[PDB]
Amino acid sequence: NELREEFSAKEYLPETSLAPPGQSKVDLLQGSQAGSKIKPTAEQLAQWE
Amino acid sequence: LPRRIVPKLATFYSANPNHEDRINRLERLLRKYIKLPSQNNNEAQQTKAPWISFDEYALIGGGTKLKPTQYTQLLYMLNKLHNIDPQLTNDEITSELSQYYKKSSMLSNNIKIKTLDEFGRSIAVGKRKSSTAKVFVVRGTGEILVNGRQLNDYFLKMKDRESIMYPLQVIESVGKYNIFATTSGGGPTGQAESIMHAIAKALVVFNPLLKSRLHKAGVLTRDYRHVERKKPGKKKARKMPTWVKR
Amino acid sequence: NILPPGVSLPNDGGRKSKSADVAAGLHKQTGVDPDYITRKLTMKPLVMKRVSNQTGKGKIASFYALVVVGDKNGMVGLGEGKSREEMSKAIFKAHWDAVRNL
Amino acid sequence: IHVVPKLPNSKALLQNGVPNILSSSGFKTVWFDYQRYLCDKLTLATAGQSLESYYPFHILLKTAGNPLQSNIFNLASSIHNNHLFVENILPSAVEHGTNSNAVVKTEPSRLFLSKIKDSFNGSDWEVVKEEMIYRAENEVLGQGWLFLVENNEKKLFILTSNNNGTPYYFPRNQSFDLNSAISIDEFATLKQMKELIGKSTKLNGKVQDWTMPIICVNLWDHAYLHDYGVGNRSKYVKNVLDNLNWSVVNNRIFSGI
Amino acid sequence: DEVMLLQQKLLYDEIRSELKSLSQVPEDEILPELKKSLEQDKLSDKEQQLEAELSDFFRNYALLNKLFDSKTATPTKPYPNLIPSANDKPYSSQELFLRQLNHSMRTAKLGATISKVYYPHKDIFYPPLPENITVESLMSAGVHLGQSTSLWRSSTQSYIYGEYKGIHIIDLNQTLSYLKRAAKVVEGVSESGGIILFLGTRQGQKRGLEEAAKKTHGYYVSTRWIPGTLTNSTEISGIWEKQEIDSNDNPTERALSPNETSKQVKPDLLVVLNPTENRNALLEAIKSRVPTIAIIDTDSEPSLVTYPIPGNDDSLRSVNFLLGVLARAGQRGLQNRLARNNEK
Amino acid sequence: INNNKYNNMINLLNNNNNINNNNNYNNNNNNYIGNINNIYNNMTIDNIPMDILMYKYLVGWSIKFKGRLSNNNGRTSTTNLLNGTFNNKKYLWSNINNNYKLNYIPSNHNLYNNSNINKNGKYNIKVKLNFI
Amino acid sequence: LKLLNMILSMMNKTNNNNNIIINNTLDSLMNKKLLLKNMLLDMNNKKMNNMKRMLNNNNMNPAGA
RNA sequence: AAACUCCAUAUAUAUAAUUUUAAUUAUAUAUAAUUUUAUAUUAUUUAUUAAUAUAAAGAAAGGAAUUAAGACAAAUCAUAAU
Ligand SMILES: [Mg+2]
Ligand SMILES: [Mg+2]
Ligand SMILES: [Mg+2]
Ligand SMILES: [Mg+2]
Ligand SMILES: [Mg+2]
Ligand SMILES: [Mg+2]
Ligand SMILES: [Mg+2]
Ligand SMILES: [Mg+2]
Ligand SMILES: [Mg+2]
């Protein structure tokens, strides 16, 4: 109910109406896991080092 | 009530009025806010503004008369206004720099990161000269097969075997992978070198952060060298018949 | 029709006086009015001749025309023009210059 | 040319000196004289030099490093500190003499009191005044200045300058009289200051510091000698803080907005 | 109120770490243990109601919503994006800077006000009216220092007061007379509503030109003069667009026919600060019938310019001082015109 | 034209009458975005085709009269009349690329020559035209 | 049921990998005010990918841009 | 002139019931580079810069066609035509 009421205070995009705590009213992103990618498992890091 | 025709820009009689007025507007902003010092140590809030290319600026600024010095001064002044700690900037600076930011971002897709297949083997295809080679690399012991035959039977020259093994040697993993080469086309060296290139490509799937080591080793670059066509009026390409002075 | 923007449909040009073209052009560049040039100015050439310069290609012939323009009321101008295409163009440039040099 | 600033309600001050602080004659001794003297000496010092285009605060900052340019620094520091003192004791900055709105009264701001609570050991303002007078008497033998400053750390200290030493620059505070014997800890602090200035790599041998002041009380004998005779300096300062113009003071506190 | 924001600023990052951690957690390990729990984990409470409400919440906020939307005042707080430091934490660099400004506006002024001192910027922003120009003011500006004797052009013999220390000294009574004449020629043209062009190409003059042009609603060229700008206008300046303005110098926001744009606009007055280098500009003006004003040194030819102003041309202070007087006169003319057309 | 079509895609897919949603669009392989009507809204036969037609205007043309035309001492003469420009400006700025007809003729160029016989011999009139 | 088992597990592992036994930790409502927010924005990112992929798949325009 | 162009190169999509097989291929469309970034050592109009090296991001390195105006009264009346 309170989440719905918070959305009632806005009549715009889902991201803008969401009001994330870290601001970022627009969260445009291209691709999947562009920055995080896949974490190098332990043996890969050890081999690289 | 009387009306008369006058130019837009105060620089209408200058060489390049458009660029001059844009720089004038930027200079007014830069001198109205001579305070608000620059950013601290960089690498945290820099190298994020793409600005605008020479061509993209010309269509809105100097155009044909756009000068290299004019562009350098423009970007220099844009950088100076960008280099203000964000928690003191105001809407005027940001609003004026919005135009020069431009929607430089371009959507990207179709990456298709390579992954191990159902049997845990990496499949890659290299090439050289007239050759091709599809290689299945799966972890194990240092066993290799070319077209179903042994390495020594297929490749008499030991240099071809050394080239094939180099990728597995750049990274010290010579005795940890099983190679199943299926080269076709060209002669022995082209086949061997296409196998080596395919092996280097296949090893990346196993440890993606080993790409640079291979790239610096030069095994990840494709050898574009190939036979050049026999030119019409002369002998075998780049050779001519004897030329007689008299 | 496929007339592109910024261009005008051609009309009578053979019977359109070159004086009108000179008057329109001069008004475009300078502030002179066209009506005075067309009406109260008189054209009469003075020196028409073929002038030749030779280059590596060969002799290059140019038409040199010198004309005067006046109102028979106090103003007179002198103008010379050169052209290789034809002598009518040379007279056009001379008429242009002379009206400029009143 | 440096000219003495025009003070508000100047007729009132000329007729009688700041009430509860100095008599007409005394005020004429500090302001309206010895201030024109200060300005004239400074102008004669910097006339025809690039320093004559700057204000006393800026010249004293520029001069701190130079050893043998100290006369100008000394002159400028005196001028700046003196006007600070006059402003913070001015009966009313607003020119309401014609309006006769004597109802105006000045009280400390709640933020200012909160800052006192944070500083020292959370003592009351009256205790601060008492101990401030205490130190003024005990570690300023000749003339000097009494400062309640604020540092970058957001903590008020009391600077006992023994001369025209601006709080702005701790290398030039002149807080310890070396002519008399000095304690071990004070000498240790002095050596630490030696090291801190030595650390600076700037060609002019300068060091960052903010420490801008909030309260100024003149300790030069140009102020109390006449009104408070001699040895009564403690009573002079006591009455000075009693009727201190608070509006300017609490404004000197960074409002944070 | 601040309690919500004081909990590690942006809290709930632990859930983000956890969902990131399970992103790499294979599904084959946890799916078996939870797929069969559905048939036995209903337990008590209104399961039908909560599932239906969640489905409606999903439909109306994740599946049926305007993701892309459509198509796409009062400076209450300066530095609106500042992040104030904590009460216990000390000042930050930015709060220190604002505190510096707070002290700077008034406290730094404490001491002795300055008088009888020359501030260069005041020669552009606060120029004096021609009527109250004194010979001493010109001499302080340095307009009296001509070029060396070895460079003298004899055509300017009447303008020079003598030679001192190897340079010719310009008479300043004459400079003042010519300057006032030129100044109110500019004022008259500005009141008439003409176009005033300010030309100067020496280094460091741009600030004066720009300021003068904006005060007089005129135009300036700090870049190099382009040959043919006036005689070959259609070819040079024919590509840049103009506007129609009313008696109040307010644009009419009306489109212009191609013939109107292609016409030529001719300055009604040209002011040149270095007539020795911009000779072609002077010759274009003389040929195109445009009155000109120029600063004439002991090296320039006074007969090229309609309204000479004998003075030094190689010093920024002198040209700025002269140009400031001219700009102020033009500004006064503009104000008079605006007053007249606002009220007759 | 491209922007108009792209906006039509975004508007159509964002709303689609607010009925079709994920798991219903068949995002695996199907690409049916919506009704054909909105795909080409305000994109019809009366605005699109004429303004995308190429080789409309003749900007440059040259004629060459080579032969024994002039009755000079007996030599030959060539007269050339080059008017306009002979390069297409919409091929190096935009993204369309020029195609070389028969691998040796720029598409924008239409050229031909015809011969004949006069009292003196044979002459040739060579005409080359550029159509932007 | 609309699954909701994954909901229970994520609440169970909310404090996992940081500390097994922790109290509410001054949360809004046992960590639900901004949890649905994160789920919603993740789903929005999925739909953003859906938008781009379908746009690319159906993209066809005349050349000469 | 350069660029667009073609052979070749890297990648994406589509087609092929993998008995016309080779899919390690064929050929249609598109993208890519006349590479970018950073650092330093240089001479300089002072980074409002060039070459020297380094680094890291890249698959990225070639060939073909096109040979202007004029001159050689160069060759061709045996390609053909007058
Ligand atoms: Mg060969
Ligand atoms: Mg001079
Ligand atoms: Mg096969
Ligand atoms: Mg070429
Ligand atoms: Mg040739
Ligand atoms: Mg030659
Ligand atoms: Mg022969
Ligand atoms: Mg024969
Ligand atoms: Mg024959």
PDB file of N, CA and C in Angstrom, chain C residues 25-78:
ATOM      1  N   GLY C  25      22.176  42.866 -59.783  1.00  0.00           N
ATOM      2  CA  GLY C  25      23.393  42.438 -59.117  1.00  0.00           C
ATOM      3  C   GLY C  25      24.013  43.540 -58.284  1.00  0.00           C
ATOM      4  N   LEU C  26      24.111  44.742 -58.851  1.00  0.00           N
ATOM      5  CA  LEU C  26      24.712  45.848 -58.117  1.00  0.00           C
ATOM      6  C   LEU C  26      23.907  46.177 -56.869  1.00  0.00           C
ATOM      7  N   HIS C  27      22.581  46.204 -56.984  1.00  0.00           N
ATOM      8  CA  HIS C  27      21.754  46.429 -55.805  1.00  0.00           C
ATOM      9  C   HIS C  27      21.979  45.335 -54.772  1.00  0.00           C
ATOM     10  N   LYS C  28      22.213  44.107 -55.230  1.00  0.00           N
ATOM     11  CA  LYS C  28      22.480  43.011 -54.309  1.00  0.00           C
ATOM     12  C   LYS C  28      23.759  43.261 -53.522  1.00  0.00           C
ATOM     13  N   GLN C  29      24.832  43.667 -54.204  1.00  0.00           N
ATOM     14  CA  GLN C  29      26.104  43.871 -53.517  1.00  0.00           C
ATOM     15  C   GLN C  29      26.187  45.269 -52.911  1.00  0.00           C
ATOM     16  N   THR C  30      25.991  46.302 -53.721  1.00  0.00           N
ATOM     17  CA  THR C  30      25.997  47.673 -53.243  1.00  0.00           C
ATOM     18  C   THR C  30      24.561  48.127 -52.995  1.00  0.00           C
ATOM     19  N   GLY C  31      24.413  49.343 -52.488  1.00  0.00           N
ATOM     20  CA  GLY C  31      23.109  49.857 -52.139  1.00  0.00           C
ATOM     21  C   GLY C  31      22.370  50.572 -53.244  1.00  0.00           C
ATOM     22  N   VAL C  32      22.919  50.594 -54.459  1.00  0.00           N
ATOM     23  CA  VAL C  32      22.302  51.352 -55.536  1.00  0.00           C
ATOM     24  C   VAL C  32      20.941  50.764 -55.884  1.00  0.00           C
ATOM     25  N   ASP C  33      20.006  51.650 -56.363  1.00  0.00           N
ATOM     26  CA  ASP C  33      18.693  51.128 -56.704  1.00  0.00           C
ATOM     27  C   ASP C  33      18.656  50.667 -58.158  1.00  0.00           C
ATOM     28  N   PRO C  34      17.815  49.686 -58.496  1.00  0.00           N
ATOM     29  CA  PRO C  34      17.815  49.176 -59.870  1.00  0.00           C
ATOM     30  C   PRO C  34      17.125  50.103 -60.855  1.00  0.00           C
ATOM     31  N   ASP C  35      16.081  50.793 -60.400  1.00  0.00           N
ATOM     32  CA  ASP C  35      15.267  51.578 -61.320  1.00  0.00           C
ATOM     33  C   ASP C  35      16.094  52.653 -62.004  1.00  0.00           C
ATOM     34  N   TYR C  36      16.952  53.337 -61.250  1.00  0.00           N
ATOM     35  CA  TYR C  36      17.763  54.391 -61.844  1.00  0.00           C
ATOM     36  C   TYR C  36      18.721  53.823 -62.881  1.00  0.00           C
ATOM     37  N   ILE C  37      19.363  52.695 -62.569  1.00  0.00           N
ATOM     38  CA  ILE C  37      20.299  52.091 -63.513  1.00  0.00           C
ATOM     39  C   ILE C  37      19.584  51.706 -64.797  1.00  0.00           C
ATOM     40  N   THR C  38      18.411  51.088 -64.676  1.00  0.00           N
ATOM     41  CA  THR C  38      17.702  50.613 -65.858  1.00  0.00           C
ATOM     42  C   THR C  38      17.189  51.771 -66.705  1.00  0.00           C
ATOM     43  N   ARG C  39      16.693  52.829 -66.066  1.00  0.00           N
ATOM     44  CA  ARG C  39      15.981  53.884 -66.780  1.00  0.00           C
ATOM     45  C   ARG C  39      16.896  55.033 -67.195  1.00  0.00           C
ATOM     46  N   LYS C  40      17.610  55.623 -66.239  1.00  0.00           N
ATOM     47  CA  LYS C  40      18.274  56.902 -66.443  1.00  0.00           C
ATOM     48  C   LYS C  40      19.772  56.771 -66.701  1.00  0.00           C
ATOM     49  N   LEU C  41      20.243  55.592 -67.092  1.00  0.00           N
ATOM     50  CA  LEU C  41      21.639  55.389 -67.454  1.00  0.00           C
ATOM     51  C   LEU C  41      21.719  54.926 -68.899  1.00  0.00           C
ATOM     52  N   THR C  42      22.734  55.404 -69.612  1.00  0.00           N
ATOM     53  CA  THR C  42      22.914  55.106 -71.024  1.00  0.00           C
ATOM     54  C   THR C  42      24.196  54.317 -71.232  1.00  0.00           C
ATOM     55  N   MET C  43      24.105  53.281 -72.056  1.00  0.00           N
ATOM     56  CA  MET C  43      25.214  52.390 -72.360  1.00  0.00           C
ATOM     57  C   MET C  43      25.741  52.709 -73.750  1.00  0.00           C
ATOM     58  N   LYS C  44      27.051  52.894 -73.864  1.00  0.00           N
ATOM     59  CA  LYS C  44      27.642  53.024 -75.188  1.00  0.00           C
ATOM     60  C   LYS C  44      29.111  52.625 -75.111  1.00  0.00           C
ATOM     61  N   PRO C  45      29.514  51.532 -75.754  1.00  0.00           N
ATOM     62  CA  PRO C  45      30.908  51.092 -75.658  1.00  0.00           C
ATOM     63  C   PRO C  45      31.876  52.051 -76.331  1.00  0.00           C
ATOM     64  N   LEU C  46      33.135  51.947 -75.912  1.00  0.00           N
ATOM     65  CA  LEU C  46      34.215  52.799 -76.391  1.00  0.00           C
ATOM     66  C   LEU C  46      35.338  52.030 -77.063  1.00  0.00           C
ATOM     67  N   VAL C  47      35.849  50.977 -76.437  1.00  0.00           N
ATOM     68  CA  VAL C  47      36.984  50.227 -76.960  1.00  0.00           C
ATOM     69  C   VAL C  47      36.660  48.745 -76.860  1.00  0.00           C
ATOM     70  N   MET C  48      36.386  48.121 -77.999  1.00  0.00           N
ATOM     71  CA  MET C  48      36.218  46.679 -78.105  1.00  0.00           C
ATOM     72  C   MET C  48      37.400  46.124 -78.882  1.00  0.00           C
ATOM     73  N   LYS C  49      38.067  45.117 -78.330  1.00  0.00           N
ATOM     74  CA  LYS C  49      39.221  44.557 -79.016  1.00  0.00           C
ATOM     75  C   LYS C  49      39.582  43.213 -78.410  1.00  0.00           C
ATOM     76  N   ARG C  50      40.268  42.403 -79.210  1.00  0.00           N
ATOM     77  CA  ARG C  50      40.744  41.098 -78.780  1.00  0.00           C
ATOM     78  C   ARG C  50      42.172  41.222 -78.272  1.00  0.00           C
ATOM     79  N   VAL C  51      42.408  40.713 -77.069  1.00  0.00           N
ATOM     80  CA  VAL C  51      43.694  40.801 -76.395  1.00  0.00           C
ATOM     81  C   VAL C  51      44.196  39.386 -76.165  1.00  0.00           C
ATOM     82  N   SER C  52      45.461  39.145 -76.489  1.00  0.00           N
ATOM     83  CA  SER C  52      46.014  37.800 -76.530  1.00  0.00           C
ATOM     84  C   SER C  52      47.189  37.677 -75.574  1.00  0.00           C
ATOM     85  N   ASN C  53      47.152  36.645 -74.743  1.00  0.00           N
ATOM     86  CA  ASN C  53      48.268  36.230 -73.908  1.00  0.00           C
ATOM     87  C   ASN C  53      48.634  34.804 -74.274  1.00  0.00           C
ATOM     88  N   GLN C  54      49.926  34.503 -74.309  1.00  0.00           N
ATOM     89  CA  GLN C  54      50.381  33.172 -74.674  1.00  0.00           C
ATOM     90  C   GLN C  54      50.949  32.458 -73.460  1.00  0.00           C
ATOM     91  N   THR C  55      50.597  31.187 -73.334  1.00  0.00           N
ATOM     92  CA  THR C  55      51.021  30.333 -72.242  1.00  0.00           C
ATOM     93  C   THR C  55      51.673  29.082 -72.823  1.00  0.00           C
ATOM     94  N   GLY C  56      51.972  28.124 -71.949  1.00  0.00           N
ATOM     95  CA  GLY C  56      52.490  26.855 -72.425  1.00  0.00           C
ATOM     96  C   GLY C  56      51.517  26.154 -73.350  1.00  0.00           C
ATOM     97  N   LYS C  57      50.220  26.258 -73.051  1.00  0.00           N
ATOM     98  CA  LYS C  57      49.213  25.688 -73.937  1.00  0.00           C
ATOM     99  C   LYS C  57      49.245  26.356 -75.303  1.00  0.00           C
ATOM    100  N   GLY C  58      49.375  27.668 -75.331  1.00  0.00           N
ATOM    101  CA  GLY C  58      49.404  28.412 -76.570  1.00  0.00           C
ATOM    102  C   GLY C  58      48.822  29.792 -76.361  1.00  0.00           C
ATOM    103  N   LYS C  59      48.474  30.431 -77.471  1.00  0.00           N
ATOM    104  CA  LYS C  59      47.885  31.758 -77.408  1.00  0.00           C
ATOM    105  C   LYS C  59      46.494  31.675 -76.800  1.00  0.00           C
ATOM    106  N   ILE C  60      46.242  32.505 -75.793  1.00  0.00           N
ATOM    107  CA  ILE C  60      44.953  32.568 -75.118  1.00  0.00           C
ATOM    108  C   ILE C  60      44.368  33.943 -75.385  1.00  0.00           C
ATOM    109  N   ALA C  61      43.232  33.979 -76.068  1.00  0.00           N
ATOM    110  CA  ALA C  61      42.615  35.221 -76.501  1.00  0.00           C
ATOM    111  C   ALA C  61      41.553  35.657 -75.504  1.00  0.00           C
ATOM    112  N   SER C  62      41.559  36.944 -75.181  1.00  0.00           N
ATOM    113  CA  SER C  62      40.610  37.528 -74.252  1.00  0.00           C
ATOM    114  C   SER C  62      40.010  38.779 -74.871  1.00  0.00           C
ATOM    115  N   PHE C  63      38.747  39.032 -74.550  1.00  0.00           N
ATOM    116  CA  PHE C  63      38.010  40.164 -75.090  1.00  0.00           C
ATOM    117  C   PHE C  63      38.014  41.286 -74.065  1.00  0.00           C
ATOM    118  N   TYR C  64      38.515  42.452 -74.458  1.00  0.00           N
ATOM    119  CA  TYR C  64      38.615  43.604 -73.573  1.00  0.00           C
ATOM    120  C   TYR C  64      37.667  44.684 -74.069  1.00  0.00           C
ATOM    121  N   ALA C  65      36.688  45.034 -73.243  1.00  0.00           N
ATOM    122  CA  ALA C  65      35.667  46.008 -73.589  1.00  0.00           C
ATOM    123  C   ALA C  65      35.663  47.131 -72.568  1.00  0.00           C
ATOM    124  N   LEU C  66      35.594  48.365 -73.058  1.00  0.00           N
ATOM    125  CA  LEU C  66      35.569  49.550 -72.211  1.00  0.00           C
ATOM    126  C   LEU C  66      34.343  50.363 -72.585  1.00  0.00           C
ATOM    127  N   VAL C  67      33.485  50.634 -71.603  1.00  0.00           N
ATOM    128  CA  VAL C  67      32.202  51.274 -71.835  1.00  0.00           C
ATOM    129  C   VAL C  67      32.058  52.452 -70.884  1.00  0.00           C
ATOM    130  N   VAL C  68      31.118  53.334 -71.209  1.00  0.00           N
ATOM    131  CA  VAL C  68      30.798  54.484 -70.376  1.00  0.00           C
ATOM    132  C   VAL C  68      29.307  54.481 -70.086  1.00  0.00           C
ATOM    133  N   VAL C  69      28.951  54.984 -68.907  1.00  0.00           N
ATOM    134  CA  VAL C  69      27.564  55.070 -68.474  1.00  0.00           C
ATOM    135  C   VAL C  69      27.344  56.444 -67.868  1.00  0.00           C
ATOM    136  N   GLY C  70      26.270  57.113 -68.276  1.00  0.00           N
ATOM    137  CA  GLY C  70      25.949  58.418 -67.741  1.00  0.00           C
ATOM    138  C   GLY C  70      24.462  58.670 -67.825  1.00  0.00           C
ATOM    139  N   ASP C  71      24.028  59.719 -67.135  1.00  0.00           N
ATOM    140  CA  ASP C  71      22.627  60.110 -67.119  1.00  0.00           C
ATOM    141  C   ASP C  71      22.342  61.325 -67.985  1.00  0.00           C
ATOM    142  N   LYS C  72      23.343  61.847 -68.690  1.00  0.00           N
ATOM    143  CA  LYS C  72      23.199  63.112 -69.402  1.00  0.00           C
ATOM    144  C   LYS C  72      22.716  64.212 -68.467  1.00  0.00           C
ATOM    145  N   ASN C  73      23.060  64.099 -67.186  1.00  0.00           N
ATOM    146  CA  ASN C  73      22.673  65.102 -66.209  1.00  0.00           C
ATOM    147  C   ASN C  73      23.771  65.426 -65.208  1.00  0.00           C
ATOM    148  N   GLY C  74      24.968  64.864 -65.350  1.00  0.00           N
ATOM    149  CA  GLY C  74      26.059  65.222 -64.466  1.00  0.00           C
ATOM    150  C   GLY C  74      26.979  64.091 -64.058  1.00  0.00           C
ATOM    151  N   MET C  75      26.497  62.851 -64.067  1.00  0.00           N
ATOM    152  CA  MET C  75      27.313  61.707 -63.691  1.00  0.00           C
ATOM    153  C   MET C  75      27.695  60.865 -64.897  1.00  0.00           C
ATOM    154  N   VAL C  76      28.929  60.368 -64.865  1.00  0.00           N
ATOM    155  CA  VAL C  76      29.476  59.522 -65.913  1.00  0.00           C
ATOM    156  C   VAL C  76      30.486  58.586 -65.270  1.00  0.00           C
ATOM    157  N   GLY C  77      30.584  57.373 -65.806  1.00  0.00           N
ATOM    158  CA  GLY C  77      31.506  56.392 -65.280  1.00  0.00           C
ATOM    159  C   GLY C  77      32.224  55.667 -66.398  1.00  0.00           C
ATOM    160  N   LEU C  78      33.403  55.154 -66.060  1.00  0.00           N
ATOM    161  CA  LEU C  78      34.242  54.407 -66.987  1.00  0.00           C
ATOM    162  C   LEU C  78      34.523  53.034 -66.400  1.00  0.00           C
TER     163      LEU C  78
END
